[PDB]
């Protein structure tokens, strides 16, 4: 791969701004990721019906 | 007992009792060796000296030649 930018997208968060924090503790809670299911999944299935 | 603990650059002449009285209370335990030291930029206090060139380089070569020199610290 020969390019300056472009590999910066999957490697990390592109021009990352952390959310400004305050008055409520937001360190314990976290989100549950997406179920892969790589035996039914289609490129059409992620983007949805146009 | 009369002046601010740290502002800097006093416009009048203070006394020895009005500048070098100790700070009261207990020291806070919420600071480290670096955070409790009187530092100026992240690793200590750096101030311009005006030592004579010959005496400076004398003690420098004295340490570099044998292994000892006089102390340039100003109180210690």
């Amino acid at each position: 791969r020969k390019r300056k930018r472009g590999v910066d997208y999957n490697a990390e968060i592109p021009f990352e701004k952390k959310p400004a924090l305050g008055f409520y503790d937001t360190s314990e809670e976290n989100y549950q990721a997406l179920d892969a299911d790589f035996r039914k999944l289609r490129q059409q299935d992620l983007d949805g019906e146009l | 007992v009369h002046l601010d603990p740290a502002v800097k650059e006093v416009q009048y002449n203070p006394t020895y009792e009005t500048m070098f009285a100790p700070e009261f209370g207990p020291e806070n335990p919420f600071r480290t060796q670096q955070m409790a030291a009187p530092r100026n930029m992240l690793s200590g206090y750096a101030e311009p000296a005006h030592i004579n060139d010959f005496m400076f380089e004398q003690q420098r070569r004295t340490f570099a030649t044998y292994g000892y020199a006089l102390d340039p610290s100003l109180d210690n």
């Binding site: - | 007992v1 009369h2 002046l3 009285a21 209370g25």
Partner: protein, 159 residues
Amino acid sequence: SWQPPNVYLETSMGIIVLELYWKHAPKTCKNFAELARRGYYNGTKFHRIIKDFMIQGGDPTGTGRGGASIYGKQFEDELHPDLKFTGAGILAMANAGPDTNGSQFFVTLAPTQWLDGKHTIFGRVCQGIGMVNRVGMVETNSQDRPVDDVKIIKAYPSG
């Protein structure tokens, strides 16, 4: 040579009432009660406020090095073998070293071992721990100095 009960502070944030122990240390109690009586604290501030440690107060210069007493600038401590620094509210006497006490108190916020290792327990607060907590939640800076003024307005040697 009399022994009043609780001392009435009237700060900017509210009214703290101080229950001062006359058995364990009567000499600091007579000093502090006399200074509250004369009008020494009317207009002085809580110069040093640390989060969850204590609130140091009482300085006509408002610096943390000034102050004097009725005895004159110093007197010995009352390091009692019963009084121990545990929990918020405990009123105390500020120090400079061994047995040097001026006119600076501090209400403690947290259980501390080094304090009753080397400090004098004056007394405690009885009425007003919420105002103590609101004073503890005030913005500070590098050397633990408030940006605004957290000053005491009046003081009464009641009881």
